[PDB]
Design an enzyme around this catalytic site. Structure first.
Site, PDB file in Angstrom:
ATOM      1  N   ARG A  46     -39.507  21.039  67.432  1.00  0.00           N
ATOM      2  CA  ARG A  46     -40.633  20.415  66.222  1.00  0.00           C
ATOM      3  C   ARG A  46     -42.022  20.693  66.738  1.00  0.00           C
ATOM      4  NH1 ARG A  46     -40.376  15.933  68.091  1.00  0.00           N
ATOM      5  NH2 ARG A  46     -38.751  16.142  69.975  1.00  0.00           N
ATOM      6  N   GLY A  47     -42.817  21.110  65.573  1.00  0.00           N
ATOM      7  CA  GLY A  47     -44.220  21.018  65.560  1.00  0.00           C
ATOM      8  C   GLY A  47     -45.035  20.407  64.501  1.00  0.00           C
ATOM      9  N   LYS A  48     -46.322  20.388  64.534  1.00  0.00           N
ATOM     10  CA  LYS A  48     -47.076  19.636  63.753  1.00  0.00           C
ATOM     11  C   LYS A  48     -46.762  20.330  62.304  1.00  0.00           C
ATOM     12  CE  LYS A  48     -51.517  18.238  64.745  1.00  0.00           C
ATOM     13  NZ  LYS A  48     -52.777  18.474  65.021  1.00  0.00           N
ATOM     14  N   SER A  50     -44.202  22.345  61.638  1.00  0.00           N
ATOM     15  CA  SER A  50     -42.909  23.296  61.264  1.00  0.00           C
ATOM     16  C   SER A  50     -41.603  22.597  62.228  1.00  0.00           C
ATOM     17  CB  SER A  50     -42.898  24.854  61.769  1.00  0.00           C
ATOM     18  OG  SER A  50     -43.139  24.964  63.050  1.00  0.00           O
ATOM     19  N   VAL A  52     -37.986  24.335  64.027  1.00  0.00           N
ATOM     20  CA  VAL A  52     -37.466  25.493  64.582  1.00  0.00           C
ATOM     21  C   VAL A  52     -36.161  25.559  64.889  1.00  0.00           C
ATOM     22  CG1 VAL A  52     -37.703  27.720  65.834  1.00  0.00           C
ATOM     23  CG2 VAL A  52     -39.898  26.692  64.891  1.00  0.00           C
ATOM     24  N   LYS A  67     -37.674  29.060  61.050  1.00  0.00           N
ATOM     25  CA  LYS A  67     -39.108  28.394  61.063  1.00  0.00           C
ATOM     26  C   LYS A  67     -39.053  27.779  59.581  1.00  0.00           C
ATOM     27  CE  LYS A  67     -43.671  28.306  62.371  1.00  0.00           C
ATOM     28  NZ  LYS A  67     -44.885  29.131  62.613  1.00  0.00           N
ATOM     29  N   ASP A 155     -54.168  30.259  69.298  1.00  0.00           N
ATOM     30  CA  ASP A 155     -53.280  29.274  69.814  1.00  0.00           C
ATOM     31  C   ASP A 155     -52.415  29.725  70.940  1.00  0.00           C
ATOM     32  OD1 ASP A 155     -52.443  26.453  69.814  1.00  0.00           O
ATOM     33  OD2 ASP A 155     -50.734  26.804  68.159  1.00  0.00           O
TER      34      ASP A 155
END
Ligand SMILES: CCCOc1ccc(CN)cc1Cl
Ligand SMILES: CCCOc1ccc(CN)cc1Cl
Ligand SMILES: CCCOc1ccc(CN)cc1Cl
Ligand SMILES: CCCOc1ccc(CN)cc1Cl
Length: 327
Positions: A46-48, A50, A52, A67, A155
């Site tokens: 989990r990302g800010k 998305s 995956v 994604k 990033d």
């Protein structure tokens, strides 16, 4: 008088000389395919921006990475798609294979080549000096390629670097914060992850370039060779510059602010203090000495510099004596 302008020392005009079609992502036409060709297998992370997943392309029984993009500006999704399409097939760059939408939810999803990120915890062998040199070179190939293509990743961090150690395969992922470089453009400094933010971002110097990625790479190298994660451990964006100043010293920071006529935020008044420039050798301990060498410290010293212009370019880094032993 305002801040002194700056431009990249390399690949300065690569977007200038290309037709707008290449860099005008807002005008790019995205063709959304049908997500039924894919079956989701497991959650990867989990990302800010998305979620995956590991998936299977049911038409050929091949593993893929999907994604699923979280709520964001349409402009940002178009930017990431256009950059991935421009960089497709570049060395050690994640490959976009498909762009799909679920017929019902209509949620945007990017489909990539499978990458099998090694569970490093289940290996008898620990990281060696050769492993760091090998994988740092693979990241550099990716960065020199994307910078040559007029793109800043913005990033670079360990979580955005996938390694399949069994096949000695590395992929630079998550191009969601990446941007086209246009000389003289003032960029948003709210990019990169705190520990990897370059001093230009922290002092709000907007006219930055590809050299931002080189600072991030230097933070990663320091953390690996010294076994100190993260290397500069700030608790906020202002404190992040203070952790850097405790190593690089305050005198070189004031030379940097003076050179670019940078307006320093008054929040820095009571926290910067006075700090001497530390020798890199002082971070060597019995637990990390097998990863440290005179070559590694000379290379590190040439990446972790306040002055973005004085940092090695990805191509100059590749020619450093630190990589003489790599294939
Ligand atoms: C032919 C050069 C075009 O220059 C630019 C293109 C896009 C942007 C971002 N809005 C900025 C510039 Cl200077
Ligand atoms: C230099 C070798 C260690 O570097 C890594 C190992 C694993 C991962 C997984 N994200 C990332 C990095 Cl940079
Ligand atoms: C600790 C805050 C000090 O602030 C500065 C230091 C150096 C410069 C460059 N003449 C500017 C400021 Cl605001
Ligand atoms: C590759 C051979 C080692 O290279 C070096 C040795 C010493 C220094 C300065 N102490 C620098 C380098 Cl690159």
């Amino acid at each position: 008088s305002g801040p002194v302008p700056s431009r990249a020392r390399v690949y300065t005009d690569v977007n200038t000389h290309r037709p707008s079609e290449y860099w005008d992502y807002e005008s790019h036409v995205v063709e959304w395919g049908n997500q039924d060709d894919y079956q989701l297998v497991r959650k990867l992370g989990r990302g800010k921006y998305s979620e995956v997943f590991e998936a299977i392309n049911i038409t050929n029984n091949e593993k893929v990475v999907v994604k699923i993009l979280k709520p964001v500006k349409k402009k940002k999704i178009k930017r990431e798609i256009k950059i991935l399409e421009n960089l497709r097939g570049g060395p050690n760059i994640i490959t976009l294979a498909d762009i799909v939408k679920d017929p019902v939810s209509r949620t945007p999803a990017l489909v990539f080549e499978h990458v099998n990120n090694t569970d490093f915890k289940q290996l008898y062998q620990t990281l060696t000096d050769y492993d760091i040199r090998f994988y740092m070179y693979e990241i550099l190939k990716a960065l020199d390629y994307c910078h040559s293509m007029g793109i800043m990743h913005r990033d670079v961090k360990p979580h955005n670097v996938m390694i399949d150690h069994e096949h000695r395969k590395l992929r630079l992922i998550d191009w969601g914060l990446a941007e086209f470089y246009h000389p003289g453009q003032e960029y948003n400094v709210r990019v990169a992850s705190r520990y990897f933010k370059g001093p230009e971002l922290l002092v709000d110097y907007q006219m930055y370039d590809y050299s931002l990625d080189m600072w991030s790479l230097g933070c990663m190298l320091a953390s690996m060779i010294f076994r100190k994660e993260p290397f500069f451990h700030g608790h906020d964006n202002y404190d992040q510059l203070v952790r850097i100043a405790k190593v690089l010293g305050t005198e070189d920071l004031y030379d940097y602010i003076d050179k670019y006529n940078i307006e320093l935020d008054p929040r820095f008044n009571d926290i910067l203090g006075r700090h001497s420039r530390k020798r890199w050798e002082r971070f060597v301990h019995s637990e990390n000495q097998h990863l440290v060498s005179p070559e590694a410290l000379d290379f590190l010293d040439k990446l972790l510099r306040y002055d973005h212009q004085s940092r090695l370019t990805a191509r100059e880094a590749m020619e450093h004596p630190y990589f003489y032993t790599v294939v």
